Design a protein around this ligand. Structure first.
Ligand code: IOK
Ligand code: IOK
Lengths: 228, 227
């Protein structure tokens, strides 16, 4: 089980579990921004479930506890995926390697500009700190398990042994980061400061998710069930 | 300045800045009972913000964006912190203790209630000490709307760059607190994480609340006159 894995081990199996590069699908003999979003979000979804299930401990869960998470964390895992490949492309959003975008395109829809700009903003942010792929996967994980921990169902008995399992996985993923930046050669002080700005950027991505939701909402449960 | 303070020094001036406990103002309604009480808590927050080590160095535009972004978040963690010895209940004011059913008559408060109630339990379980709390409340002040000002012009660059160093300062403040406490450094690293990851749930709750607070449709005219 996950709760024996190592820093060394956790990273690797996390890199292992990475989804595949997905290429957009637009008229080459030429368009909508919406459908361009819908299309590939769908497909980015299907491979989430296949990565999620590869996250250590996510399986140890429950099908109900696994469906709540993903139903809460989905837009955030996309965003931090996007923002990661968008780093060497300042001012542009690298959805797919054949679908780099920028501001003016997000303005075509109805509220995408603000989300673009926060998106671009986190990209710059991560750019500044020089985010390693090894921390990125940690943080995609931490976005997964932290999604809807504190809103499962009830304070029952099982609910509690569950919550107790994630909180230990998360704790385990944390030593991974700390240990990653340790290897890197940072003084302990810089480990604690680095880890915090990283864990503070998660508030921003959550905030964009809710932001994003409000127009995506302006079924999914029944879908994750079949896939999970 | 804040970037000269020590842990004990930062704690002190943070403990120092702590606002006063407010009692509610009372067929009674939850809204006006709620509305009434935040306002007056807002007025004390503004005077608490102005006492946060480093917030002053910023700009009236960088000071008015922050507060205007993270207000609901400072209240919520402030409520959720006193609501800790009150399992299932939200201690708004010492005379306005509530629960789900108290929030149920208003049209959406239960969901915010429940998640509100859950963070309290979380804080309880981890045994959140006031000195880590005052720190986290500051961290929500500084993290508020950092990456969302407008432009990275000349001052914005030096400003955001200063914020990130205040926060870097608070960050070590907490560690020494848990360190002093005698945790393995590993235990310091987990706690700081379980702690800072809870700030997304407060943020997530704030965004929810906003959705409803503008479901009932100012601040600027206040922060400007009070700052
Ligand atoms: C810009 C982000 C999209 C993040 C994203 C989308 C697809 C992908 O492959 C990778 C990353 N969108 C939102 O935050 C909200 C959103 C809107 C949206 C925003 C504003 C107004 C209307 C619709 N349409 C969709 C469609 C699919 C996912 C998210 C979203
Ligand atoms: C339950 C939470 C916390 C509100 C709150 C108010 C005062 C205070 O000192 C601490 C916390 N409410 C909100 O986040 C949003 C909100 C609503 C609200 C939300 C949903 C439906 C109706 C009303 N009414 C008010 C009034 C004053 C401040 C915030 C709020």
């Amino acid at each position: 089980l996950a709760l024996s894995l190592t820093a060394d081990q956790m990273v690797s199996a996390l890199l292992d579990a990475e989804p595949p590069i997905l290429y957009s699908e637009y008229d080459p003999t030429r368009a909508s921004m919406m459908g361009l979003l819908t299309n590939l979000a769908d497909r980015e979804l299907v491979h989430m479930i296949n990565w999620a299930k590869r996250v250590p401990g996510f399986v140890d869960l429950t099908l109900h506890d696994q469906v709540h998470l993903l139903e809460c964390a989905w837009l955030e895992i996309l965003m931090i995926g996007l923002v990661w490949r968008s780093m060497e492309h300042p001012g542009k959003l690298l959805f797919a390697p054949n679908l780099l975008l920028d501001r003016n395109q997000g303005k075509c829809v109805e509220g995408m500009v603000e989300i673009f700009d926060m998106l671009l903003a986190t990209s710059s942010r991560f750019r500044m700190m020089n985010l390693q792929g090894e921390e990125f996967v940690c943080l995609k994980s931490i976005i997964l398990l932290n999604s809807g921990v504190y809103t499962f169902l009830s304070s029952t008995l099982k609910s509690l042994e569950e919550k107790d399992h994630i909180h230990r996985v998360l704790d385990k993923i944390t030593d991974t980061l700390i240990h990653l930046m340790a290897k890197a050669g940072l003084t302990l002080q810089q480990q604690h400061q680095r880890l915090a700005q990283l864990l503070l950027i998660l508030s921003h991505i959550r905030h964009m998710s809710n932001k994003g939701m409000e127009h995506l909402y302006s079924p999914l449960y029944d879908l994750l069930l079949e896939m999970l």
